[PDB]
Amino acid sequence: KKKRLKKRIFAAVSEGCVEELRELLQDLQDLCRRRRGLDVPDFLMHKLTASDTGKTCLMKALLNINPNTKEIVRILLAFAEENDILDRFINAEYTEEAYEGQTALNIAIERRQGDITAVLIAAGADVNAHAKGVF
Amino acid sequence: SRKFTDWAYGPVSSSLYDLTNVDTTTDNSVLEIIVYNTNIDNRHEMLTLEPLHTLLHTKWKKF
Amino acid sequence: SKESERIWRLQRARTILEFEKMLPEWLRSRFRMGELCKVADEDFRLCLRINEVKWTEWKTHVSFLNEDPGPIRR
């Protein structure tokens, strides 16, 4: 029925912090298990990332901040661990060739979010990502 | 508000003023009344302000 | 001196609006960015302006408007 799960998660991480995301978080496991053995990391990554911008479900939570945003990462890191695709997700560089290579790590330094920085390092992110682009 | 921040990306912000009654596109705006008015000894400090300064710099620049 | 810079700038402004009054065309010369949204769900109006700012007193910038571009996207 073409459920708006990519649209719903973007409006969730801005302001609808905890409870609306987790009700959507249970919905995605129901939508992946139906194929009973597909290419699993190909499908779940495409349902978290726009085609053109390449923006993840983490970075959209990282651009706008909110005094609940420590919670919005740990819930989102634990979901990427239950499908064992956290490593390709945490190093998901921007690929729209505007400011390409700017990863989810790079937003955390520039926004001066020191607390979720060490959380983002503890998952094992690459601290060496080159960012070419329009700048 | 009459001012917005488009994007930050570090210490380089981009300004954006509202400009709805300020430039000469309507009748009797602030720019027309700040130039064609006597009886004010404080005009030459007024045009230093940011929605007036760079705009009047821009309108002289392009034509 | 150190005050003629301001009062001559007025004498520039005496001419600039005079050329505005001299040309009652449709004004193809645009001098603003039209219909750019400030913030609403419906009101996308009040044509705008762009300048640049500078350094220290950093803070966590909450209210942005776009996904950090410098120029237009695409």
Side-chain angles (χ1 to χ4, degrees), chain A residues 52 64 94 99 111-112, chain C residues 58 60 62 64 67-68 74:
Chain A
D52 196 3
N64 209 166
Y94 188 79
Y99 51 93
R111 290 290 191 273
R112 301 180 67 195
Chain C
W58 294 273
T60 61
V62 177
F64 64 93
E67 52 99 25
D68 296 334
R74 185 65 60 85

Side-chain angles (χ1 to χ4, degrees), chain A residues 20-89:
Chain A
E20 188 176 1
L21 180 63
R22 189 174 294 170
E23 293 293 327
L24 184 59
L25 191 66
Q26 185 61 255
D27 187 77
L28 187 57
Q29 285 298 112
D30 198 4
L31 195 144
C32 185
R33 66 183 292 164
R34 188 177 295 173
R35 300 291 295 163
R36 63 186 70 183
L38 79 164
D39 284 330
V40 183
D42 193 6
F43 180 72
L44 186 142
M45 186 62 73
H46 186 274
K47 300 285 103 175
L48 293 176
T49 301
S51 176
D52 196 3
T53 61
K55 292 172 69 176
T56 66
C57 67
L58 180 59
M59 292 190 287
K60 182 64 182 293
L62 284 176
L63 294 180
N64 209 166
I65 59 99
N66 192 0
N68 295 316
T69 190
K70 182 172 71 175
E71 183 68 29
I72 204 69
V73 180
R74 187 177 65 246
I75 298 302
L76 199 145
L77 289 177
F79 177 71
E81 192 268 332
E82 293 295 326
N83 209 168
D84 289 330
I85 198 57
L86 60 90
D87 181 74
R88 289 181 67 252
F89 179 72

Side-chain angles (χ1 to χ4, degrees), chain C residues 14-73:
Chain C
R14 297 291 297 166
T15 66
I16 296 172
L17 300 180
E18 184 67 29
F19 281 96
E20 295 294 327
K21 193 266 298 295
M22 193 178 176
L23 278 75
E25 61 179 358
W26 59 88
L27 271 71
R28 185 181 66 189
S29 181
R30 299 295 178 185
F31 58 80
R32 78 269 185 190
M33 292 181 183
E35 291 177 352
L36 269 296
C37 61
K38 298 193 291 180
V39 271
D41 291 330
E42 189 269 329
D43 191 4
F44 292 173
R45 290 173 67 89
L46 284 81
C47 61
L48 293 173
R49 183 64 178 170
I50 285 174
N51 285 320
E52 298 300 322
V53 208
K54 287 180 182 180
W55 284 267
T56 70
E57 294 178 352
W58 294 273
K59 62 182 179 292
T60 61
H61 294 282
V62 177
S63 67
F64 64 93
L65 291 176
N66 286 312
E67 52 99 25
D68 296 334
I72 187 170
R73 295 182 289 120

